[PDB]
Amino acid sequence: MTMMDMNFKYCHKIMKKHSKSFSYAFDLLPEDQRKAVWAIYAVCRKIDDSIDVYGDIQFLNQIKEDIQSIEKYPYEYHHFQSDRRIMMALQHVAQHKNIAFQSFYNLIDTVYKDQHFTMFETDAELFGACYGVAGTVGEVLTPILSDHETHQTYDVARRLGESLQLINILRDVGEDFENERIYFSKQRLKQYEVDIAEVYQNGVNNHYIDLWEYYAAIAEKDFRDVMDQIKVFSIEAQPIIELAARIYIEILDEVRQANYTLHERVFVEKRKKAKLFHEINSKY
Ligand SMILES: CC(C)=CCC/C(C)=C/CC/C(C)=C/[C@@H]1[C@@H](COP(=O)(O)OP(=O)(O)O)[C@]1(C)CC/C=C(\C)CCC=C(C)C
Ligand SMILES: [Mg+2]
Ligand SMILES: [Mg+2]
């Protein structure tokens, strides 16, 4: 094992630890592509988790500055300020692939703004936040998972990322509420006559289920639209991306089976993930 191998192994550790669904799928990529995914993953994770390190923007600004160094000077040695192992790996990737740096900056800005989080007035705001947290990730992964990037490739990847973020929201309603976050828009909550606090205390009702299913239907339709355009991605990545998405889509059915509970995080069992892989893989 080289030093750089050690750097990617560490990124892999982070992804396996923190992202059971995405780890399962993306680890099936060919070596050079999965390694790039691990590095992108670990960067994004550090960005997402940065505020809780000291309680403020310090570690985040250090990440941003590290990324800026890489963008400006991809072939120079940097004394990274944040997590050196992750940044060395990102830099190695950047030397070989087009990285959409502005997409990382969009994600960072999204994390900065989350410090001042006020509920979304409308679904348009909510979907805007989904872009910032996850459409950006889709954009960053595009050159990794496709052979000749076009506007269509980016668009599909962005849509997928945003759909997965909406599923994430749908899984985590109760936990988010405990953390003083509600992501359903004020407009939709008012229309469906849903108070999340009241539902957290008293159990689901038909109003809440109707509202949840309204968003679920959006995530599903977007998922189907991505599946229909899967050929934008490289032949090797197609079944893997399909797997990643299907595993995440299955979370919706898990929520339903747990009666839309606001008091635990549902999950797709490993054995089910394997079932989905068999189904997809026979198709390919
Ligand atoms: C780079 C990579 C694979 C992921 C990035 C992971 C990170 C940390 C981003 C920081 C912001 C966050 C938190 C975003 C949410 C990820 C789930 O959180 P995680 O905690 O890992 O898993 P779980 O909550 O299930 O335990 C999310 C739903 C976005 C998924 C978007 C994807 C996969 C692109 C799809 C498009 C193509 C594949 C073209
Ligand atoms: Mg996680
Ligand atoms: Mg969540």
Swiss-Prot record:
What are the required cofactors?
Answer: Mg(2+)
Listed binding positions for (2E,6E)-farnesyl diphosphate 2 are R45, Q165
EC number(s) stated in the UniProt entry for this protein: 2.5.1.96
Q: Where does Mg(2+) 1 bind?
A: D48, D52
Q: What job does this protein perform? A: Involved in the biosynthesis of the yellow-orange carotenoid staphyloxanthin, which plays a role in the virulence via its protective function against oxidative stress. Catalyzes the head-to-head condensation of two molecules of farnesyl diphosphate (FPP) into the colorless C(30) carotenoid 4,4'-diapophytoene (dehydrosqualene).
- Mind telling me what this protein is named? 4,4'-diapophytoene synthase
Keyword check for Cell division: no
Positions of (2E,6E)-farnesyl diphosphate 1 binding: H18, S19, K20, S21, Y41, R45, R171, Y248
The entry's keywords: Carotenoid biosynthesis, Magnesium, Metal-binding, Transferase, Virulence
Give the similarity note. Belongs to the phytoene/squalene synthase family. CrtM subfamily.
Catalytic reaction(s) noted? 2 (2E,6E)-farnesyl diphosphate = 15-cis-4,4'-diapophytoene + 2 diphosphate
Q: Name one GO molecular function term.
A: metal ion binding
Listed CDD domains: Trans_IPPS_HH
Q: Quote the pathway field.
A: Carotenoid biosynthesis; staphyloxanthin biosynthesis; staphyloxanthin from farnesyl diphosphate: step 1/5
> Does the keyword Metal-binding feature in the UniProt annotation?
yes
Look up and give the organism this protein is from.
Staphylococcus aureus
